[PDB]
């Protein structure tokens, strides 16, 4: 039997599924450590590796990209978990090696690949404390080209009144996602700052792991793919909506939680986002 992880329910993805919308024909690049394409609860449609010493994007030697992918798009069947957008076309864009790290140029090359390959959504469950002009140009280029770009806010927690959101989440063009638990409490590790946009479940998140496994991970890395997956659901229901409109739909329909410095606009609600008229619940 399949299980629906709590975070998929918490963002109201089942409401879209029951309307008949599951992310069909929407192209989502998981820009990450690869995706284990042999996993029976994943279907990987394509991809590319920008890691010089790891040229197969369908081999995930870290486990992180596989877990992130399962939250976006684990298949709807009788096994494992259910993803937010279980019919999405999932692309493994490998820019991190086994050790979970990548050079800025590898990330940028993956973002370029995604633009050149007409991806509708990019998820980057990744980040660094500093930006670069070339990194900012890549994400801004993707957005100018119509791509919804989602990234983890970071796991830096609080630091007085300072922002701790990392890059690329910190760039205005990227939706920066922080982590809550099943009670909608911000996770203590979740980065904070005026650049925090929305929140999604990022504590004890069950998903696919390499070698046909499943496990519960924690991080803004886990929160981000709830939002990338929600963007794919919204695009499957409204295939002509621009990235601008998908992003505003998600922002304008959150369930507000606390102060926006800690919670941004609150928890995403993809049911409300995918209606024509948007308000917060």
């Amino acid at each position: 039997a399949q299980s629906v992880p709590y975070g998929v329910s918490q963002i109201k993805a089942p409401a879209l599924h029951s309307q008949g919308y599951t992310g069909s024909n929407v192209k989502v690049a998981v820009i990450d450590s690869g995706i284990d394409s042999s996993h029976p609860d994943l279907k990987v449609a394509g991809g590319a590796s920008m890691v010089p010493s790891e040229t197969n994007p369908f081999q995930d030697n870290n486990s992180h990209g596989t877990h992130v992918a399962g939250t976006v798009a684990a298949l709807n069947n009788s096994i494992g978990v259910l993803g937010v957008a279980p019919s999405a076309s999932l692309y493994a864009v490998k820019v991190l090696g086994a050790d979970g790290s990548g050079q800025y140029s590898w990330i940028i090359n993956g973002i370029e690949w995604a633009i050149a390959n007409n991806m509708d959504v990019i998820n980057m469950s990744l980040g660094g404390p500093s930006g670069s002009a070339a990194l900012k140009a890549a994400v801004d280029k993707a957005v100018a080209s119509g791509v919804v770009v989602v990234a983890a806010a970071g796991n830096e927690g609080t630091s007085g009144s300072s922002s701790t959101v990392g890059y690329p989440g910190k760039y205005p063009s990227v939706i920066a996602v922080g982590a809550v638990d099943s009670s909608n409490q911000r996770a203590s590790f979740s980065s904070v700052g005026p650049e925090l946009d929305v929140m999604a479940p990022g504590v004890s998140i069950q998903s696919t792991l390499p070698g046909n496994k499943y496990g519960a991970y924690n991080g803004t890395s886990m929160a981000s793919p709830h939002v990338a997956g929600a963007a794919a659901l919204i695009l499957s229901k409204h295939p002509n909506w621009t990235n601008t409109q998908v992003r505003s739909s998600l922002e304008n329909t959150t369930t507000k939680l606390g102060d926006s410095f800690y919670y941004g606009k609150g928890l995403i609600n993809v049911q409300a986002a995918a209606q024509h008229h948007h308000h917060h619940h």
């Binding site: 990450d32 450590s33 870290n62 992180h64 877990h67 820019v95 991190l96 050790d99 979970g100 790290s101 990548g102 050079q103 800025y104 590898w106 990330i107 469950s125 990744l126 980040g127 660094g128 404390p129 500093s130 983890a152 970071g154 796991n155 830096e156 990392g166 996770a187 590790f189 991970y217 924690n218 991080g219 803004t220 890395s221 886990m222 981000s224």
Partner: protein, 63 residues
Amino acid sequence: KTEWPELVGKSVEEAKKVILQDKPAAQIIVLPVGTIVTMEYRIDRVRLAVDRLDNIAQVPRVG
């Protein structure tokens, strides 16, 4: 103890020694400063960010 700001500017060797006194089960990974990394949170992990001289360039923290 989950952050080590006093280790910034120390050698990577001293930083590993000090962190393992405070957190003997720590899984330490050394990476060049200015790389991009996965954003999962691992309570057992302490990443070290080093400059080109192999000195600590950013505050180590658990995660």
